Structure 1
Amino acid sequence: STIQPGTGYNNGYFYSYWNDGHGGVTYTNGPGGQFSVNWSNSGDFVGGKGWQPGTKNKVINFSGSYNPNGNSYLSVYGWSRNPLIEYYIVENFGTYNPSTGATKLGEVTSDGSVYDIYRTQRVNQPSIIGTATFYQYWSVRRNHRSSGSVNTANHFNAWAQQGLTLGTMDYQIVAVEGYFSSGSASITVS
């Protein structure tokens, strides 16, 4: 069903839904690995379904519809702890490339596309441990898609070759993000 921001497990899938307190977003958990997001003149939000804890070698499958009108992205999204790391494997995005401002670290080929990899430091920003400072890693698919399989190990290994030390895995989801935009998405994870 439709829920306010929070975390939990639904039909065997972890979910996380976060927003900045601005209105305009409706997040709904559905059967199995399915979730939907519908948004209209939102603020900043990110939510979806997957695993808690994730793993460093998961092959993540997703399918469904992704129709943003503005700034948004569809990604494999997760965290590690000790050290604290936020990471995104971006499969599709809307009007803004979310790696803008991050430092390019190279390229990796995975699951049918080249990806550009990046990192940036986030300073005194929201996180799974509260306000914190942490590196944020990106891997941005060149050939955008809304269904596919992601071999996370290829991305983790590419980042590691440029200095990522992944700590203890925390959640790991397929997420829809929006940033002052509108859209809809209906995604099934497995």
Structure 2
Amino acid sequence: QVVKPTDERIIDPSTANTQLTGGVCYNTTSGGNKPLAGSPYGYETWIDTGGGVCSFCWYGADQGGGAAFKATWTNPHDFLGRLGYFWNENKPYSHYENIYCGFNYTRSGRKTAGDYSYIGIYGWSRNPSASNSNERLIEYYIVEDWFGNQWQADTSPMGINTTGGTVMGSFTVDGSSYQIIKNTRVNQPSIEGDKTFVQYFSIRQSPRKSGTISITEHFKKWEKLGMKLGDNMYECKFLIEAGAGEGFFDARLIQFYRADNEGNILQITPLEHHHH
């Protein structure tokens, strides 16, 4: 019986379409999470110097929901820029309760991010007590949008031809069905070095550029399908990933908040209510 938060600090994503200015930009790999001053969030950049130049700019603590960013890339090799909650505190996802992200962005069009690309929520979690050694580390995506490619429209959701792995099931939340995929990465790079791990994906069947993501509902449905996250969630951040191409991403809103089952706010940016 989870009640949607209605708190006045929550920015309606559908009309949060005012261009932001005064970004602070990072053009190089950050080497993991880096906390931001005056902010609950941290950023990470993966900018591969064997490929092209990228830029990643945070719009700061006092506008756009506190987590808005802009990114540009020029023929990268798998650029990832991300910003949001960083945890790795040895607490399960359920400790952080009901997690929401309100977003609104523009981006470049179809075929401007290479053959694969991802926009949405991203992170990792650790489950060392899993019987299956392959499932003790988890990388996860909730995919709201992407840039399509030469063979598929950006209006058409990606499938397992992009993600790899196996369709485990589906559910409906936040106005769309989501396809749930599980993939095993065999001796691939990770936050624990090169090893076998699993990826969980929720793919939004109707892609979109603004709205609200009920993140915890994804964690819950993954868990009911046997896709366990374990007792140490690493992070929960908004992501732009571009395989290649020449494009941009520019958020007018990224707003994380957390709330209990009654809907009451536990954490939110900005912290204070809106004097005239």
The normalised TM-score by structure 2 is 0.64
Are the structure 2 counterparts of residues 158 and 140 from structure 1 closer, same or farther at C-alpha, using a change threshold of 3 Å? same
Deviations 1:72-108 (A, max 9, x none): 2211001101331000000001125264222101111
Asked whether the 8 Å contact 1:62–1:174 carries over to 2, the reply is no
Alignment match, 2:71: 37
1:20 deviates by: 3.3
Q: Is the 8 A contact 1:99 1:138 kept in 2?
A: no
Q: Which moved more, 1:110-119 or 1:151-160?
A: 151-160
Give 1:70 deviation, angstroms.
3.4
- In structure 2, list runs of 5 or more residues that go unmatched: 1-23, 62-66, 128-135, 150-157, 256-276
Residue of structure 1 equivalent to 2:269: none
CA deviations on 1:9-30 (whole Å, 9 max, x unpaired) are 2241211111333223212222
Divergent runs of 4+, >4 A: none
Indicate the structure with greater strand content. 1
Matched, 1:91 2:144: yes
Alpha-carbon distance in structure 1 between the residues aligned to 2:234 and 2:78: 22
The answer as to whether partners of 1:99 and 1:140 remain within 8 angstroms in 2 is: no
Say whether 1:77 aligns with 2:101: no
Partner of 2:184, secondary structure, is strand
Alignment match, 1:19: 47
| Aligned equivalent of 2:80 | 46
Larger radius of gyration: 2
Q: Is 1:63 the equivalent of 2:101?
A: no
- Picking from 238, 246, 253, the partner of 1:174 is 238
**1: CA distance between counterparts of 2:29 and 2:159?**
22
Q: Is the 8 A contact 2:29 2:48 kept in 1?
A: no
Task: Supply the distance in 2 between the matched residues of 1:127 and 1:62 (Cα, whole angstroms).
Answer: 27
Report SS of the residue matched to 1:70.
Answer: coil
Q: 8 Å contact 1:61–1:189 — kept in the other structure?
A: yes
Q: 1:108 to 1:173 in 2, by over 3 A?
A: same
TM-score by length of 1: 0.91
**Contact 2:47/2:76 (8 A) holds in 1:** no
Structure 2 residue corresponding to 1:138, chosen from 174, 188, 201? 201
Aligned to 2:35: 9
Q: Distance in 2 between matches of 1:124 and 1:155?
A: 26
| Structure 1 stretches lacking a partner, 5+ long | none
Q: Identity of counterpart residues, as a percentage?
A: 34
